[PDB]
């Protein structure tokens, strides 16, 4: 990490910025504004298998989103039957 964190500021950015790639939105791209935040038709893909989530059946979660092919997983795999 670093140190010497400077102070904040006040900017007037009038343009949606993907909450994933931190990039503006509007470049001939389909906006996928969600309840959480805005995202690009692409960046808005399962963070497990990178699957497109454009009006598809999935299980949205907190600060995360898993597709119907991921959400239904078995974390058990990780650890063992200690
Ligand atoms: Zn994006
Ligand atoms: Zn998935």
Domain ranges of the chain: 1-82
What is the CATH number assigned to the segment(s) 1-82?
A: 2.10.110.10
Q: How far is the CA of 11 from the centre of ligand 2 (A)?
A: 36
Q: How far is the CA of 35 from the centre of ligand 2 (A)?
A: 19
Ligand nearest to the CA of 59: 2
Q: How far is the CA of 17 from the centre of ligand 2 (A)?
A: 24
- In our burial notation (b when 16+ CB lie closer than 10 A, e otherwise), range 5-36 reads eeeeeeeeeeebebeeeeeebeeeeeebeeee
d(CA 72, CA 70): 5
Q: How far is the CA of 42 from the centre of ligand 2 (A)?
A: 14
């Amino acid at each position: 990490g670093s140190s010497g964190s400077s102070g904040p500021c006040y900017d007037n950015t009038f343009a949606n910025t993907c909450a994933e790639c931190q990039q503006l939105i509007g470049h001939d791209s389909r906006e996928l504004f969600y309840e959480d935040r805005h995202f690009h038709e692409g960046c808005f893909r399962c963070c497990r298998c990178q699957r497109s989530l454009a009006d598809e059946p999935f299980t949205c979660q907190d600060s995360e989103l898993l597709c119907n092919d991921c959400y239904c997983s078995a974390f058990s795999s990780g650890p063992s039957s200690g």
